[PDB]
Each structure stands twice: as C-alpha cells, then as structure tokens.
C-alpha cells in the first residue's frame, strides 16, 4: 500500500479516441450513387463521383470519400478531427496569453500560424529601406 500512493499518480498514456460511428458507417458510401452497367452487373467508373466527394476524416483510415448528399451525418467527426487532440487545459497556455493572436483557433485547433523568421523580417524590412 505504501507504494500505491506514489505509483497510482503516474499519468497513463492519453489520446483522443474520437467518436465511432456505428449507425452511419461512412465506409459503405463509396458504393452510393454508382451507376451499374447492365450486362456486367458492376459499378462502371464514374469520373464525376470523386468530385462530389466530401472526404470524411477517420482514425483508422486516412479519409473516406462520401457523396456530398450524405455528408451531414458526419459533421461531428469533422469537428472532432479539427480539434487539437489534446484537452484544451493542457494547451491552454496558447490561448490566454498574447499568443492568442498568433495561433489558429477554428474548431479549437490550437495550431500555430505562419511566423516570419528573424532573418527574413530583417531583409523584408530592409528591401523596403525603412
């Protein structure tokens, strides 16, 4: 028991398991709105299909292309993919101070904006001779 006080405090490995979708399996929508050729009985190639495709993110698969018309069932797993995978309270330090202005924050994506180097800002202000 003596040990259990100062070993149960170790922070176990964390990650952002984002919401699984049982009722709306987005993988079986690569077979939606696919013209089937008559004699062959198979999905003839629709070159227009991949452009009405709203690529849905996923944790086991890179992105799953869905036809636009069924995209609205996957608006959460979109807002869960943009969100910085950390809890905010660990990346809070990028939100309260004056790095609030130098950081993207759409959908709580606590990611950095582009910053000029210190050597570029030198040349980019001397070439204006100011």
């Amino acid at each position: 028991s003596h040990q259990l006080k100062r070993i149960l405090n170790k922070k176990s490995l964390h990650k952002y398991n984002w919401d699984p979708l049982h009722m709306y399996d987005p993988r079986k929508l690569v077979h939606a709105n696919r013209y089937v050729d008559h004699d062959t009985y198979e999905e003839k190639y629709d070159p227009h299909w991949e452009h009405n495709a709203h690529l849905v993110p996923d944790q086991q698969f890179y992105n799953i292309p869905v036809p636009k018309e069924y995209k609205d069932a996957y608006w959460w797993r979109d807002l869960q993919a943009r969100r910085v995978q950390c809890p905010t309270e660990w990346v809070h330090f990028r939100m309260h101070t004056k790095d609030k202005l130098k950081y993207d924050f759409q959908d709580l994506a606590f990611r950095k904006k582009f910053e000029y180097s210190y050597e570029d800002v030198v040349a980019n202000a001397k070439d204006m001779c100011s």
């Binding site: 993988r27 079986k28 690569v30 077979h31 696919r34 089937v36 050729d37 008559h38 009985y41 198979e42 999905e43």
Partner: protein, 212 residues
C-alpha cells in the same frame, strides 16, 4: 530511499565536487612534461615539471612541489609503511615556465598556419614570446593483450561482407513481408466491400426485371 542530513551533504559536496556537469577546465592546457611554476598558496613561486595530470579534477602532479608522506597501512605481512610523495595540486594556482621568457604566460590551443605547420596550425601558443608548443598524446598501453583470447589484427581485417549476395537477400526478406500485409489488408477491402457491391449488382438485376 532517503536523503542525508543537511550537514551530511555539505560535507559530501565539498569532497567530490567534480560530480558537477563539466567540472573540467574548458580548454585543457596542462599536460605531462609541461614546465610550470606555482603562483599562490603554499610555497608561492617554485618551479617543477609536471609528471601526471588528473584531468577531471583540474589538478596536477608536479615534481618536488607540495610533497607529503603517504602513509601505507598494511596487514600482518608488512609493517606500517610510510612513503613520501608529492600531491595533486590544483591547476588554478600554477602557470607555465615559458621556455624563453620564464615568466607568466597563458597558453591557448590556436588555429591557422604560420610557417609550414603540418596541419597548418599551431598547438599551444605563448602570448608573450610567441614560441608555440605542441599538445602531445596520452599514452595507450603497449603491453596489453591476451594471446589466448585476442584475435590478431588480420582476422579482424578479412572482409567477408559481399553486399551483392546478402543485401539483395535482405530486401527479399523485407519485401515479402510488405507484399503480404498489404494484400492481407485487402481482406476487409474485399470481405466487407464485396458484400456491398452485391446489394448493387443485386439491384441492377431486380431493376432489369421490373421494367420487363
């Protein structure tokens, strides 16, 4: 596991100070055989050549300077033996006997070529006179080795590595594994997707029928 008393560390930090990170002197300019004189403390001003250097401690063993009697306690075989021996003195209190000016002279490893320097570089420059110095090498053991367990230098020089019959074999042992899981990653790509495209190819059939 427990710490020590406050007063206990205080005693143990002064004994073994080099346990700090980078206790050595940032450039190492003191070497065995250097001609150095002490400066301050006990016997300020004696001259004697270095014989050994304890680098990690910033100290020096110098002939005839700071000599003490190293008592040698012994077991029942030998009696109590005493032996005189000069002691490690800190390099912070000694400076070099310049082979020309015989005065104070700092000594910096220097770079850049002056008069046909072999590596185009001096190795220890005196500031006052300017006659440089070399930086020798510490000695490796000459009489080390077990002939019953030491592979001679030639059995360590027999290059058996023909990379044209093993590396072409490694890339097969690797590529077989990659080509396996990838096509094995086509199970769910097939054992799950084939069922869906059936509900499509079963729809064209039941769509062909209805019109008729």
């Amino acid at each position: 596991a427990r710490d020590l008393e406050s007063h206990q560390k205080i005693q143990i930090a002064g004994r073994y100070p080099y346990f700090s990170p980078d206790y050595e002197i940032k450039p190492w300019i003191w070497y065995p055989g250097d001609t150095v004189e002490v400066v301050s403390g006990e016997g300020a001003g004696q001259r004697g050549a270095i014989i050994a250097v304890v680098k990690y401690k910033n100290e020096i063993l110098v002939q005839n300077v700071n000599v003490q009697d190293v008592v040698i306690p012994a077991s029942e075989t030998r009696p109590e033996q005493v032996v005189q021996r000069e002691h490690p003195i800190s390099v912070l209190r000694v400076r070099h006997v310049d082979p020309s000016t015989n005065q104070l002279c700092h000594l910096e490893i220097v770079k850049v070529r002056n008069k046909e320097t072999g590596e185009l570089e001096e190795r220890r420059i005196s500031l006052e006179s300017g006659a440089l110095l070399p930086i020798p090498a510490p000695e490796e053991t000459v009489e080390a080795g077990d002939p019953l367990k030491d592979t001679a230098i030639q059995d360590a020089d027999e290059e058996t590595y023909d990379r044209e019959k093993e590396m072409p074999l490694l890339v097969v042992r690797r590529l077989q594994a990659m080509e396996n899981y990838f096509v094995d990653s086509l199970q769910k790509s097939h054992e799950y997707h084939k069922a869906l495209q059936m509900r499509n190819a079963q729809d064209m059939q039941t769509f062909q029928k209805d019109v008729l």
